[PDB]
Amino acid sequence: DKKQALLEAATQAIAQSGIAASTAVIARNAGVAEGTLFRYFATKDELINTLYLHLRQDLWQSMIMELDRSITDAKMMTRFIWNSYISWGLNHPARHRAIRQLAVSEKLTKETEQRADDMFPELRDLAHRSVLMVFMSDEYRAFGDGLXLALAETTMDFAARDPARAGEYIALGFEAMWRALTR
């Protein structure tokens, strides 16, 4: 209740006013005081880190029922995942704008980064089969995610403003992402 009301309030605030979102206004619009929100998340970095995983799991539950592991070709599996992310972002923009801020933020730990891989081995397995090895390194992985989500957000924006041509924007966006970020 109040922990996910905070998680949904943090989503709204971080998507709008950035990750420099006040702990006060995240609390106040979740119908609580600032004191309330810090015994469920010790620090603002702990709120960031589990919201990122919460949003990550929300993206995966939108997809795994439609997910078909028959595909062995990395590019066709990435395309299904790419198509699903864009649709996920179009349906709930705040969840996308928030996860884009959290993914490229310094506050993320590798218990956030190694749980995110354990939570979703299929993506891990896929990344470890196509993505450029430099965008998997601890040093530049966040940058790849930033490139990543920049190409996706641009694809969303043209797909939502020009719905009649959305399908071509998804394909073009995917191909630009694919040759940019894979071997």
- Which residues are at the interface with ligand A1EKZ (CB under 6 A)? 78, 99, 103, 123, 126-127, 130-131, 135, 141, 144-145, 148-149, 181-182
CA angle (75, 77, 81) in 5-degree steps: 110
Residue from 136, 143, 163, 167 touching a copy of itself (CB under 8 A): that is: 143
Q: How many residues does the chain have?
A: 183
- Choose among ligand A1EKZ, a copy of itself, none what residue 160 binds, the Cβ cut-off being 5 to 8 Å by kind: none
Which residues contact residue 121 at a Cβ distance below 8 angstroms, ignoring those fewer than 6 apart? none
Rounded Cα gap, residues 141 and 133, in angstroms: 9
Give the 3-state secondary structure of residue 131. Answer: strand
Least distance to a copy of itself from the beta carbon of 113, Å? Answer: 17
Nearer of residues 3 and 146 to a copy of itself, judged by Cβ? 146
Taking CB under 8 A as the rule, does residue 172 contact a copy of itself? yes
- Alpha-carbon distances, residue 118 vs 47, 151, 163 (angstroms): 20, 25, 36
Question: Looking at beta carbons only, is 71 or 132 nearer to a copy of itself?
Answer: 132
CB of 99 to ligand A1EKZ, least distance (A): 6
> What SS3 class is residue 182?
strand
Binding of a copy of itself at residue 176 (CB under 8 A)? yes
Q: Is 158 in the site for a copy of itself (CB under 8 A)?
A: yes
Our finding on whether 75 is near a copy of itself (CB under 8 A) is: no
* 150 interacts with a copy of itself by CB under 8 A: yes
Tokens read off for 68: 């078909």
The answer to whether 83 and 89 are in contact (CB under 8 A) is: no
Smallest distance, a copy of itself to C-beta of residue 13, A? 17
